[PDB]
Amino acid sequence: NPAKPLDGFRVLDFTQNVAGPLAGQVLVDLGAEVIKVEAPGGEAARQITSVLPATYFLPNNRGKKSVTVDLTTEQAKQQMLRLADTADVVLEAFRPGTMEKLGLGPDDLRSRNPNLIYARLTAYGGNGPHGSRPGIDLVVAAEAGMTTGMPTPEGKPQIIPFQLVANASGHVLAQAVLAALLHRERNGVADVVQVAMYDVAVGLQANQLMMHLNATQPSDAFRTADGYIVISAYVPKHWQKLCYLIGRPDLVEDQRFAEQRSRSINYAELTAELELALASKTATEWVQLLQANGLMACLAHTWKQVVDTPLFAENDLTLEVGRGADTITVIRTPARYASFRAVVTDPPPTAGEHNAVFLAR
Amino acid sequence: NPAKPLDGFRVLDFTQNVAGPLAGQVLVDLGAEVIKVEAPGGEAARQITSVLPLATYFLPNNRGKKSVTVDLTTEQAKQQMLRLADTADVVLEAFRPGTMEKLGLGPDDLRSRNPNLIYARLTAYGGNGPHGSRPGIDLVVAAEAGMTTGMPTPEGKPQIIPFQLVANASGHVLAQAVLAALLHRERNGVADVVQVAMYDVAVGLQANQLMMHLNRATQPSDAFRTADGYIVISAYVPKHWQKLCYLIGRPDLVEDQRFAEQRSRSINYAELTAELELALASKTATEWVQLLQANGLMACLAHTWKQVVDTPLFAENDLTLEVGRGADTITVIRTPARYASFRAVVTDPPPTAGEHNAVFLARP
Ligand SMILES: [Cl-]
């Protein structure tokens, strides 16, 4: 078995739910030893099994070790202190100021261990009174303005039905941890790392938020004879090729849509004109025509459809964990490497599985 | 100036638009020297501007970088790139699959000459076969990955998320892989080839949702109607759920067979929403948010982007930085990760196209 980037490193994962464990999952896939620190009875996400025939817990805790502990007790605190002494990285995703209360804060652990990298993941940053609140993917996203510009028939704010902020924050946190490890390796500095879910959500909208601190058409989903097609062809070469393929050469030199900046302003009329031409063929027919001509177009798939597409199978996105009846298919982490496989087939640990190994007597 | 993790490393950035350059932007903030390789006249994204002159997709992702203008089709250009690659630690490319191989600048071409070079490829669909060979952009890749699922629109058209979620997420993932590769080289002496697909990232962002269809809740957690406006509440945990029922004056809901258990609340979400909104009718959304937040529950208003930039929390986090000299500056948002021992920020403006041609294209 080939060497991995993080072989020999030890991580203490004090995190729960999605964002924090996902970062740990990435570190596991890169070969680190990641030990979950859970409350008695295991992490609460373990019991949140909304599937019957473990959604949040299972895909993010493969190959991890586990210790179970009651951080109310002094005994526990001392065990964590001794365990932290042997750790390279500590991951915590509690409310700001929580870890300090437990006596396991940055100053507490780093005083004992000068090689320890301390990574903190919070909802809002904890840089002041406003950032002290606890948060979750839904609340953080809405507060960061991710519902903006999306109208609903009921007038209700659009809720994005997947954990976009939490999953993105996990990769950003893992990114920062890897950066800190490089910083320690090259410059001999064991740093304190901070990632805020709010900051990550703001970064995902940065181009749009930029306009208020100081689009590009055609790029939308268009109605056809049957179904919808998603087309992106705003550059002059593609925009022109598009007009020819749909049989509308007049649109190319049309004063409303002649210039790129002009198309964006007159998006409403542009949509009407395009959908008028697209009425000739079904969305499937249009997609095949445009793709053959090198234009960017596709169908808007559902989740059920996506897993069944040839492209999905082509990218080797899934792996199986467990022995037989309890074998579940999970999605791998996205980054791929040539010299090793960034995946682990070992299942998640039972709560406190490694208490004997890691907790001092 | 304190040391940064990538001081002394050199990166060749062949990428365009958002996803690729953002990864380079991350490397710049971490102290790496990143050189843009652009076509004559510069990157195409440099021209996508707004009215006051703000390149929305170029400016925030190319701060502190260096630029080299060149026509990769010519033999002279290829040779200059080969010499330039010899001095590089990392090569970033975001072209269509098979493009670099055609130009003679593929992984095998560069790594044969330079054995320490890390080759990073970012594609739309992975290029692992015929289906993944197509070019793509944030919008198209997201829609194909199923991101329009479950969101109703007035027109009945698929819901288009109005920001580049996939491109921005892919940028951080690509930077993540590059940093991992650099660690791999330092510790194991291996210079690897790393591949990141925007489609794979988009799939990963929906991992929890797609997972259900691969093996064929948590209420209350939604946006709720009040007397005035909507409130976003997340309180499915028994501790939060009980306190929520108390604060809204509905103790009956706690042991109500319909909503007693957490699984029951998930199944009967429709009736629960009706019950909750009946209680929330008493006060405006703003009044409810302050009450719940004071009691430690997770709740907020759904802000617009315009509202978001004016909030105290936004200013508290030092999210913005100004690029340029004096009054001639444009405000941009920084990369998210923060570090205590250094400042992951560069205030330098982007280079002009071909600004460093004299420095790097030689002919001294
Ligand atoms: Cl395969």
Please describe what this structure looks like.
The structure is a homodimer. With 361 residues, chain A is an alpha/beta fold. The first copy, chain A, folds into 2 domains: 1-220 and 302-361, no CATH class; 221-301, no CATH class. Helix content of chain A is 36%, strand content 15%. Chain A is built from 15 helices and 12 strands. In chain A, the strands form 3 sheets. Chain A has a 6-stranded parallel sheet with strand order 3-2-1-4-5-6. In chain A, a hairpin with a 6-residue loop joins strand 10 (318-321) and strand 11 (328-331). In chain A, helix 1 crosses helix 6 and helix 6 (164-187) crosses helix 7 (197-204). Chain A starts with 9 loop residues before the first strand and ends with a helix. Strand 12 of chain A pairs antiparallel with strand 6 (193-197) of chain B, so a sheet runs across the interface.
Number of helices of chain A: 15
- The total beta strand count of chain A reads 12
The major pleated sheet of chain A works out as: 6 strands, parallel
Largest interface: A-B, 136 and 139 residues
Spatial sequence of strands, sheet with the most strands of chain A:
3-2-1-4-5-6
What's the helical proportion of residues of chain A? 25-40%
Specify the oligomeric state: homodimer
Distance between the termini of chain A: 34 Å
Ligand types:
chloride ion
